[PDB]
């Protein structure tokens, strides 16, 4: 009953409050002041108040709120010592390996369960294969996504967070069928009034994340890459139609193609296919009954290619506005699609960063590409996505030689992660 929570962002804090209130674990958290001004402000803020706080916006989510203290906030990963039964990874998926590899042998030998909160497709494999050198029977659990939306209102008080939304449905799988830890997590979800479908494997759960299929076409195209890396004459928007945004028949086709390459990969692992339209429409953002035929939603996976694309395009067009918002007196609804692209930006030490979109999708897609090679499945759409992103990175370096740039601009990243997946797939 010690828990190590890797991450100090909003997600980590929400999760830490849940553990504090609903579990018997003594909770230690770990940041990275050694490489992050964000982490250092969190550490400094917690040191001062000796409290974290979760607020909510909608009283529907009361049970998530609270003020709490933890046992120990570690300033950096390398400081971690001792034994922990359970490790929770509330960092971004690209840091799982790099973070675990900094823990001590003593810590790593003690671990029974690693719980991955926002893994990509392939994360459990990386983490299981890694932890295997230290443990004979490591249990790894993957969720589909984090449970909701949590943020910091005020950058200067990053120990106070606000959960604004909770997802309707989440998925979870374990390396160990119907384990004690699965059942405890299931009982916890019930207590939190969150629906949780237990699926056969972590990989099954990792594939129930709409972002895997959608972010790459949306962000790794010429229109978007320009908006993020170079800028635009007038503001453009992620979810709008060309020329206001990237959405085009071309983009929708690239999405279908990527989805099918992913469905081929999933057939190899014998994981069920994902009805991308049903997911979008019944689990994410609803549309009016008049917009899409219920038969077309249900049968999406077996409909002709051109029809799958038409339905995706139509879906995106239907959420240009929030059709369930209150129209004003001129018949105008809330501009739900007016989401700006975040541009490349200088941190407070003048180092250029690439924003989460598409930083993190480069990692996800790079891993999907690598699984693909190892299984002998072709992924020409994936490949092109990655090529475009690499081009934009190289173009930025050539164009901004007087600028200090983060390691995100380098090639070829993720060698350790790739080696572990390679090894895991030789063994099964």
């Amino acid at each position: 009953s010690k828990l190590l929570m890797i991450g100090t962002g909003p997600v980590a804090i929400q999760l830490a409050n849940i553990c504090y209130l609903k579990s018997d674990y003594e909770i230690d958290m770990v940041g990275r002041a050694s490489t992050s001004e964000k982490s250092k402000r969190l550490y400094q803020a917690y040191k001062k108040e000796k409290q974290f706080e979760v607020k909510i916006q909608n009283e529907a989510h009361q049970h998530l709120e609270g003020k709490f203290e933890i046992n120990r906030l570690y300033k950096d990963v390398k400081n971690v010592k001792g034994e922990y039964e359970t490790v929770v990874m509330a960092c971004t998926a690209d840091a799982y390996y790099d973070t675990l590899q900094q823990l001590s042998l003593e810590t790593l030998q003690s671990v029974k369960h690693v719980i991955l909160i926002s893994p990509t497709f392939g994360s459990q494999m990386i983490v299981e294969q890694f932890m295997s050198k230290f443990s004979q029977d490591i249990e790894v659990i993957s969720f589909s996504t984090y449970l909701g939306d949590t943020r910091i209102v005020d950058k200067e008080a990053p120990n106070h967070v606000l959960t604004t939304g909770v997802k309707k449905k989440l998925y979870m799988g374990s390396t160990h069928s119907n384990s004690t830890m699965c059942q405890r997590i299931s009982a916890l979800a019930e207590q939190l009034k969150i629906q949780l479908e237990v699926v056969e494997s972590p990989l099954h759960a990792e594939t129930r994340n709409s972002s895997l299929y959608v972010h790459p076409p949306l962000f790794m195209n010429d229109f978007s890459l320009k908006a993020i890396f170079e800028g635009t004459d007038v503001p453009v928007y992620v979810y709008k139609l060309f020329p206001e945004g990237p959405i085009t028949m071309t983009l929708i086709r690239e999405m279908r193609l990527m989805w099918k390459e992913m469905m081929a990969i999933l057939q190899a692992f014998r994981v069920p296919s994902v009805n991308l339209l049903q997911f979008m429409v019944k689990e994410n953002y609803p549309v009016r009954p008049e917009t899409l035929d219920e038969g077309d939603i249900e049968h999406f996976e077996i409909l002709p290619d051109i029809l799958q694309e038409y339905l995706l395009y139509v879906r995106y067009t239907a959420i240009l506005i929030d059709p369930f918002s209150q129209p004003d007196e001129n018949g105008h609804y809330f501009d739900f699609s007016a989401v700006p692209f975040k541009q490349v930006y200088k941190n407070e030490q003048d180092v250029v960063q690439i924003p989460r979109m598409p930083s993190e999708d480069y990692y996800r897609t790079a891993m999907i590409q690598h699984i693909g090679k190892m299984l002998g499945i072709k992924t020409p759409m994936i490949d092109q996505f990655l090529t475009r992103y690499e081009a934009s990175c190289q173009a930025y370096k050539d164009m901004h030689q007087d600028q200090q740039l983060s390691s995100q601009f380098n090639t070829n990243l993720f060698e350790g992660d790739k080696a572990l997946v390679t090894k895991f797939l030789e063994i099964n």
């Binding site: 992620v238 979810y239 959420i319 809330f334 739900f336 699609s337 989401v339």
Partner: peptide
């Protein structure tokens, strides 16, 4: 409020 917006698309996430």
């Amino acid at each position: 409020a917006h698309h996430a």
